[model samples]
Target: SWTYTAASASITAPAQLVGNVGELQGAGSAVIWNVDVPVTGEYRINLTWSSPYSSKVNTLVMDGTALSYAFAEATVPVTYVQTKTLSAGNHSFGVRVGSSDWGYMNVHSLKLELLG
Candidate 1:
């Protein structure tokens, strides 16, 4: 016979909702993700992870709403800095990795900052 186990509930939701903020390596370098913001408001999201070994990378979402809109992708790991603006409100957001090369990411820390 086979048995199933219920998944654990999360007090903290996944990161993809606010939009991909910016990925930062421990060394202070930033990474970018080509995301579009549809609605207006302030949103901040971040991604960072590390292990006993020191290899790392960071990625940021340029426009969070691009998936919903047809804006061009900002290019992953963009060299120049990019900014986005949203309207004022108590907005909730998250981030998601539809697929990943590392098989899976064990997120160590994450935060969202909303600014106008």
Candidate 2:
């Protein structure tokens, strides 16, 4: 299990910090984090974020998975949960904007927990 927080993120240009959360300004923006899987198999992927704008999508950096999620019209930071099979190694995951994501999303953390 690993928790990658926005405070520890390798934030890039356009993707600036909104307080502690990394703000994805728009498409092509990204904030990254490196993590190690405890074992292997499927793991729970939880990305803590907040969206005040319309619903949109973000991609999982390492796996290139389309991690689409929405928290409501406007709300507090919530965890966008999903599970995917992964390999055991030092991989990375982050918030990456896509063409469709013209709006912004604030990312707090990207968590990975091994399953049984």
Candidate 3:
């Protein structure tokens, strides 16, 4: 099972949903995905995103680990694939920007696939 387009569930101040993408406008901005995992195993999560802060990284808290989101540039959306073992259950996977801060991330969708 897969979520092709991530539905907007929650957004912090200055962050909002535009179509299928969640835009994080500033530092401390965040978004949450309120969904359930269908299987428990090593999963490959493909996160489509972009940011202006070059060579920066974002904070991603998932069911398994804290993912490092590296940014290339701005606007030109990039899809990142991070692997981790997630249990079969509900997860409040989210991304946030800091001023050490959490890196700003404009997210499109999180495409999850089982690797194990």
Candidate 4:
């Protein structure tokens, strides 16, 4: 679910990942979501967000692994998907804008789907 209320917490502020369009306004801003799986398999995580008109590096951390991405400038919505082999049971899934000077973005939602 891409519901904003599903977010367990935000790094910078309590309302950093707000429901009103879900904006990641500053460096290191982020949101965390908890996911429970019935079986271990390959899962695809998709992140949806609006363009920030410049390069914005972000990272999606699942468990203890971190996947970093550089979001190019765009005028429309953008979605980035990453696949990972996850073990069954509870896991911490989180998305965060980088801590660099240009690490800022506006994120909408994050969806996880089983691919196996």
RMSD score of candidate 2 (Å): 2.5
Most lDDT-accurate candidate: 2
Model 3 CA lDDT for position 57: 60
* lDDT tens digits by residue: candidate 4, 10-107: 54542264554556666656666565765887777776667657776667665546777777675475657678776888777766665653355665
After superposition, candidate 2 runs with Cα above 4 Å error:
62-74
11-47 per-residue lDDT for model 3 (tens digits): 7756688887777776777777777888778877766
Tell me the spans in candidate 1 whose CA falls farther than 4 Å from its real position.
1-44, 51-83, 99-103, 114-116
- Model 4 TM-score, 2 decimals: 0.75
Q: Is candidate 1 or candidate 2 better by TM-score?
A: 2
Candidate 3 minimal-lDDT segment of 10 residues: 1-10
Preferred candidate (TM-score higher): 2 or 3: 3
Residue-level error in angstroms, candidate 3, position 75: 4.7
Model 3 Cα shift for residue 63 (angstroms): 1.6
- The sequence of per-residue lDDT tens digits that candidate 2 reaches over residues 56-103 is 655656444666554345457666667778877766677777675544
In order, the Cα lDDT scores of the candidates are 0.29, 0.69, 0.67, 0.62
The deviation in Å at residue 88 for candidate 4 is 0.3
Instruction: List where candidate 3 sits over 4 angstroms from the true fold.
Output: 4-6
Give the CA lDDT, 0 to 100, for residue 26 in model 4. 60
